[PDB]
Design a binder for this molecule. Structure first.
Ligand SMILES: O=C(CCCOc1cccc(Br)c1)N[C@H]1CCSC1=O
Ligand SMILES: O=C(CCCOc1cccc(Br)c1)N[C@H]1CCSC1=O
Lengths: 236, 235
């Protein structure tokens, strides 16, 4: 029973105390769902041009090398920060219309049917979980139950890797003060350094002082990087 | 169980009226063992006064007592924060920094409940609450409640987007394939001049797309454009 599985998986997961044991249980659950291999990809929101991306999975090592050789992560439609209709998408030739060399290479290496689920933590980090198999296509009868079963896996995996303080989830910690924060919302809302100084009734000589410290907490050359990074991290 | 979720999907997909969706929702909140509910949409922008819509069948005395205290500003259950599981059961400790809200809430009979939040990638963060007075939420029904509520708010967000409700919609801003690359570099702290070197363009043309981006966001400077676009998932 789904709930018995959920409960038995939860008690089994909270019992884990190491980072390689969680992927072992995950591998056992992917086969339980009727699939052969999995893939977990964590995508941080910054830097906006080359975002930090971590990838773990038990795909065949031949594909793992081919994939890394072609930089397929740059054009993979299954790990793009998009708006999946249900945070979930079943692989189809339409999904890979703008990436035919990847879909052609994938089915060749035996990954002919699969699906990817995406969760977005409200701290910018997005998570992806893919499952793949060779012979049996995804039957419409098992589609929904697959969609629900994977949403529990990704969320559980996200929560337990967070509780274990995994590095792939730990982002650069930014200590923003309540006054510093309120200025940065005004900056990000388009107000100039002079305009800000009149609402808070402070000096322009001190709104730039706070800016100089916010930029130091983001290692920012300008305010733009600070305001944009803060918005992406949910810090404002 | 599964048979319930499957049967619930048929009722919603058949709905062709917004009020009919809230009606079916209310019937589900009763099935969970709760009297009242409340759904909330929190848009990310503006950063100083975000757009917030509120609906729910709370008692009328509370709704106009809630909105008369500006309680939406100090309510922990609608904070743009990272819940341990997109979920938190109400407790005296949860409302430590908002005691006037919790004391009034218990006085008015909203003594037991839980809130569940979903973060749509459009920057919108939806929240769903359920409340009752008599029976405390016992530890044995918690995890089953966390599951049933996650399904209820996901199907609620979707069903409401497929109906084009102007609570879920945000101001469109179609960004060009290159304007998006420029704003990404700008958002990464690069200057209008440095950007021209990376892409092999003229500073006048970098400063030319900027003028169009800030026009697409109604922005005074580049900082509003970069920050707004980052909040909406556009860069
Ligand atoms: O599963 C995913 C998620 C991103 C790629 O994940 C990978 C790929 C190769 C090695 C490793 Br490790 C992870 N994408 C699919 C698209 C079709 S083939 C494929 O890898
Ligand atoms: O659920 C929430 C916040 C979201 C709903 O807010 C409200 C409150 C009153 C009328 C309406 Br409509 C929405 N807060 C809880 C916790 C304390 S008592 C309460 O209403």
């Amino acid at each position: 029973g789904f709930l018995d599985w959920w409960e038995d998986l939860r008690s089994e997961m909270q019992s884990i105390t190491d980072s390689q044991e969680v992927f072992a249980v995950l591998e056992k659950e992917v086969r339980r769902l009727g699939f052969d291999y999995y893939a977990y990809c964590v995508r941080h929101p910054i830097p906006f041009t080359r975002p930090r991306i971590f990838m773990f999975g038990n795909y065949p090592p031949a594909w793992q090398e081919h994939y890394q050789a072609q930089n397929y992560f740059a054009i993979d439609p299954t790990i793009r920060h998009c708006l999946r209709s249900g945070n979930h998408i079943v692989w189809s030739d339409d999904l890979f219309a703008d990436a035919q060399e990847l879909w052609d290479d994938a089915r060749d290496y035996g990954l002919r049917h699969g699906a990817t689920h995406s969760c977005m933590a409200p701290n910018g980090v997005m998570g992806f979980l893919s499952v793949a198999r060779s012979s049996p296509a995804i039957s419409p009868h098992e589609r929904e139950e697959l969609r629900l079963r994977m949403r529990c896996l990704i969320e559980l995996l996200h929560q337990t890797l967070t509780e274990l303080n995994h590095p792939s989830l730990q982002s650069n910690p930014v200590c923003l003060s309540h006054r510093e924060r309120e200025i940065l919302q005004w900056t990000a809302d388009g107000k100039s350094s002079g305009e800000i100084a009149i609402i808070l009734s402070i000096s322009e000589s001190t709104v730039n002082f706070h800016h100089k410290n916010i930029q130091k907490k983001f290692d920012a050359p300008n305010k733009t990087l600070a305001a944009a990074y803060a918005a992406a991290l949910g810090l404002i």
